[PDB]
Design a protein around this ligand. Structure first.
Ligand code: UDP
Ligand code: UDP
Ligand code: CL
Lengths: 232, 232
């Protein structure tokens, strides 16, 4: 416990996991970002507190981070992120949405932070299979389980720094919030295969979220989501 | 005064028949030899023609899918209630086919001749198909329309005092095989998004596992869609 850890996440599941990690480890603080929406969780404005953070902490561990860390922070203290995609494929926003569409792997990756988003030396990663009946929702739920097991399994090694991280072979691709937003509008005139349309719908089905929509002939907006059930 | 035989295998029509029995009273309610209503007696119409003609003044069927023997038609006045808008998508599950082809759907009360859902129309009422409708949601409305249309015209149907008009054209007829064919989704089929979306909503009826495909690993997967219009 000579290792003093700062945990940063705006994600509700990662936060719950951070709380368990706290019970287990002890010398550990949990914050969210200035724009995070977790109720009752204090906020570190990382961009301003670089000095405090470096002096005060031995390791900064973030979950699902979307902003880049300032170079000075990356230098002054060991920074690690947990991303719920399989780097370097579909880095950035909502990896399993884009993976359902393009067929690239999804999973959870624990990695050292550099100046680019979801980039740089990989500590560990597990792939998550995408079944033909999976929606974004069902995959995401599995990813959160994988994340919990992966992080818990490797916590000691992350804490102690007893790993050798390996950079991915290639740069992969990056998706941003705009990219998800563009997927949401369904163009009723677009041509494609049924499989293509079906993937589109399931990639945009996540429990109750009203993601996919079209505007009908009379100007009414209609929300679409899909239900896929494999036989017993 | 007028003794009615009601024939239906449909659960909603049966309930409606039970109410009509409470009103008119000189009326028996049966199902067919292959119907599945719990505890409802069965007329094997094909073999009881002489008895039916003798015993009854009107045979009123709901959602009939088998053709009446010519002997019965000539021997007693036969009227059918069909949950389609004759002559369009006569036969099986009209709104399923109507959602896909854009023809009108509704409820038609008509005289029975030698062909299925054919012969002089007594009364009919159209049901609008909204862009967010599924087969399930249309069908619920069809069952309400059927109730209202039948209660409105009951005395006249009972009386025999209506005018009836033959439809101008033959229309089209859909059979169980046709519905069965629709169910199989071909993931390589090309079309517009709107087309595919109509196909899925057409095959969505509450919990029915209608639409299906077989994935690469040989696993059968059922598909339904959930459409929700914004608050008007
Ligand atoms: O408007 C949204 C926001 C999120 N999600 C889904 O919910 C998951 C959780 O995203 P969240 O914003 O909770 O945080 P992240 O997973 O990016 O940390 C995402 O992967 C999306 O699949 C969605 O369907 N619509
Ligand atoms: O295997 C089935 C059977 C019925 N239905 C739906 O349920 C409605 C009523 O079916 P029913 O068997 O009661 O036939 P009906 O008496 O209306 O001809 C149909 O129009 C279909 O929309 C379905 O989707 N799949
Ligand atoms: Cl490795």
């Amino acid at each position: 416990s000579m290792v003093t850890i700062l945990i940063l996440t705006d994600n509700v599941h990662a936060h719950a996991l951070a709380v368990d990690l706290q019970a287990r480890h002890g010398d550990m603080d949990v914050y969210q970002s200035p724009i995070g929406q977790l109720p009752g969780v204090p906020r570190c404005d990382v961009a301003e507190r670089v000095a405090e953070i470096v002096e005060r902490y031995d390791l900064v561990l973030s979950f699902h981070c979307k902003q880049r860390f300032p170079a000075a922070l990356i230098d002054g203290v060991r920074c690690v992120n947990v991303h719920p995609g399989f780097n370097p494929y579909n880095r950035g926003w909502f990896p399993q949405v884009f993976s359902i569409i393009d067929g690239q792997k999804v999973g959870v990756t624990i990695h050292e932070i550099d100046d680019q988003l979801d980039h740089g030396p990989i500590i560990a990663q597990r792939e998550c299979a995408i079944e033909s009946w999976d929606s974004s929702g069902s995959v995401y739920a599995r990813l959160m389980d994988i994340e919990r097991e992966l992080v818990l399994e490797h916590f000691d090694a992350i804490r102690d720094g007893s790993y050798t991280a390996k950079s991915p072979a290639t740069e992969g691709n990056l998706n941003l919030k705009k990219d998800f937003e563009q997927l949401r509008r369904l163009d009723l005139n677009e041509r494609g295969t049924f499989g293509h349309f079906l993937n589109r719908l399931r990639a945009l089905t996540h429990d109750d979220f009203r993601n996919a929509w079209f505007v009908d002939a009379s100007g009414r907006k209609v929300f679409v989501r899909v239900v896929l059930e494999p036989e017993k």
